[PDB]
Structure 1
Amino acid sequence: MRTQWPSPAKLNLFLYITGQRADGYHTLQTLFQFLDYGDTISIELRDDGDIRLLTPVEGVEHEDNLIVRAARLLMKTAADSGRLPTGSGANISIDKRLPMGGGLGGGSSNAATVLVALNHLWQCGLSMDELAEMGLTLGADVPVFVRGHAAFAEGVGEILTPVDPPEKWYLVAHPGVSIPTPVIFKDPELPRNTPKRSIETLLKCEFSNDCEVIARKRFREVDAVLSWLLEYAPSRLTGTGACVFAEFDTESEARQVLEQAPEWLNGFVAKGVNLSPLHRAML
């Protein structure tokens, strides 16, 4: 039997850079919300202990793909405690709708969905806590996706606190440029002294993304996408870009702006949700 699992995108509703660690990593205060939109992952169990990703993801080698790294990591960890049945394996395929990076966390979501799905299908019985712990080694966004709830993140992104921000409708655009996360974080003009604040304060303050000024300055087309969207609604960068989102109260307004917007915005409309579609589908 084949099973299908959601792999939703996320948005950083806000993102503040508070400083830099001894190793150059940046400490942050950020808010995650899921989009009811993303990739779909299909799994068929194997009994020969093999992991086979049947669908190539543009420019990513089999062993480099987060789907495969997640599956192997779970296999190894579960086997360490004797919680992996002999012969456990899987054929995996993905319907990839999300862009590469862009600040939507697509790869991290793929990894999280795989961890949760295989844990379930192989009957390993690991807790979401255990999955999120191993998931962190694959990236700070992974635990958020694994845990399934909108969350405020601190430290370098590893310290999570579940929260319940307003759920809005979003128009998410992407001009086509692939911005590598490290390119933004290494920029000399990037703000790195935003004061650390309490969750209560951050939730009542205007939402913004500290990376946006840099993204706009260095990528003309990101600046243009922002210019166009700001004509219609509050809009900002998510993650380190290049994706930008515009906020709306209803689906109808969002979709009407999408029809009006330049086609090169490559936009899609999706509802923000505080419970991940992955966990929702498991109810």
Structure 2
Amino acid sequence: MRTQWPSPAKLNLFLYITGQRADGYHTLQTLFQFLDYGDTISIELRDDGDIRLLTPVEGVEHEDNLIVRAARLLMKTAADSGRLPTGSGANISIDKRLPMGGGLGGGSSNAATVLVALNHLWQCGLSMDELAEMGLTLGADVPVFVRGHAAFAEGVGEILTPVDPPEKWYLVAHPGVSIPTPVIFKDPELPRNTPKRSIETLLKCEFSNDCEVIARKRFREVDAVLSWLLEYAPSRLTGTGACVFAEFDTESEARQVLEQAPEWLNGFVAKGVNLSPLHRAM
């Protein structure tokens, strides 16, 4: 039989870069909230051990797809501890709505959703801790999606504390430019020394994204989108860009501004949700 599984977007409501190790990896303090909007993943079980992604994702080959990578990692990890019933396989299809990149975390969401879904359908019986561990090897943000709650992330992205930030409505704009994450993280002007602070401190401070000053400066398209939206509401970069979000108390106000937006904002409106649509449909 066929099952459907949400793969929501996220926003980083705040993102602080606390340090960079000698190998180049940046430590962060960041707050994740889900959008009630995203991809939908359909799965049909197989009993011949095969994994198939039936829907190509534009510009990614089958075996590099995070969906396939996640399913094969789960398969291999389970099998190595005798947790994988013989024949365990799946046909996987994605209704893909989230942009590629943008800082909405679509790739990580897809991998989280696949691990959680297949763990359940194959009855591998892995813990959420185990799924989150494994997921972190595939994408920086997979653990927040696997665990399913709005969360303050630190450590190397593995330390997650649930929080319940305001479930606002957002106008999420996608400036017409591609920003690969390394492009921002290699920038010499990137802040990399924001003081580590408590969740109690951060939650009461003004929210900002340390990547924003850089993305705005290097990419005119982000500067244009941000300038346009700040005339209406507090608006920030999510992830390492390019996407930018404007916060509103109600759907009507968000959509009021959307209807005034130029086409080049490539905007949509969605509500922040603290429990993931994945886990909710569970």
| Cα deviation digits, residues 105-135 of structure 1 (max 9, x gap) | 0000000000000111111111111111111
SS at match of 2:15: strand
How far, CA to CA, are the matches of 2:265 and 2:157 in structure 1? 29
Task: State how far apart, in whole Å, the 2-side matches of 1:97 and 1:268 are.
Answer: 11
SS at match of 2:85: coil
Corresponding position of 1:185 = 185
Deviations 1:230-279 (A, max 9, x none): 11100000000000000000011001111111111111111101100000
Q: Name the CA distance, whole Å, in 1 between partners of 2:233 and 2:42.
A: 36
Unaligned runs of 5+ in 2: none
Instruction: Kindly report structure 1 stretches of 4+ aligned residues shifted beyond 2 Å.
Output: 155-158
Spell out, residue by residue over 1:56-93, the C-alpha distance to the aligned partner (whole angstroms, 9 max, x if none). 00100000000000000110111112111100100101
Q: How far off its partner does 1:100 sit?
A: 0.5
Tell me, yes or no, if the aligned pair for 2:16 and 2:210 is still in contact at 8 Å. Answer: yes
Alpha-carbon distance in 2 for matches of 1:127, 1:26: 27
- How far off its partner does 1:226 sit? 0.2
- Distance (Å, rounded) in 2 between the aligned partners of 1:28 and 1:123: 34
Per-residue CA distance 1:188-228 (angstroms, 9 max, x = gap): 11111111111101000000001000000000000000011
Contact 2:172 2:246 in 1 (8 A): yes
TM-score (norm: length of structure 1): 0.98
Distance 2:135 2:157 in 1: 13
SS of alignment partner, residue 81 of structure 1 = coil
Contact 2:107 2:139 in 1 (8 A): no
The Cα of 1:34 is off from its aligned counterpart by 0.5
Deviation per CA, 1:167-188: give whole Å up to 9, x if none.
1110000022110000001101
Deviation (angstroms), 1:8: 0.1
Q: Percent identity?
A: 100
Give me the TM-score of the superposition, normalised by structure 2.
0.99
Q: How far 1:155 moved relative to its partner?
A: 2.4
Q: Which moved more, 1:184-193 or 1:153-162?
A: 153-162
Larger displacement relative to structure 2 (150-159 or 202-211): 150-159
| Contact residue 12 and residue 30 of structure 2 kept, 8 A | yes
2:32 corresponds in structure 1 to 32
Q: Is the 8 A contact 2:133 2:158 kept in 1?
A: no
Q: Does the 8 Å contact 2:17/2:26 carry over to 1? A: yes
Query: Matched residues in 1 for 2:101 and 2:53: separation?
Result: 20
Within 2, Cα distance between the matches of 1:47 and 1:240? Answer: 40
Deviation (angstroms), 1:158: 2.4
Q: Find the aligned partners of 1:156 and 1:139 in 2 and give their Cα distance.
A: 12
How many Å separate the matches in 2 of 1:132 and 1:73?
Answer: 12
- Unaligned residue ranges in structure 1 (runs of 5+): none
> How do 1:113-192 and structure 2 match up within 5 A?
113-192=113-192
Of residues 157-166 and 62-71 in structure 1, the stretch that sits farther from structure 2 once superposed is: 157-166
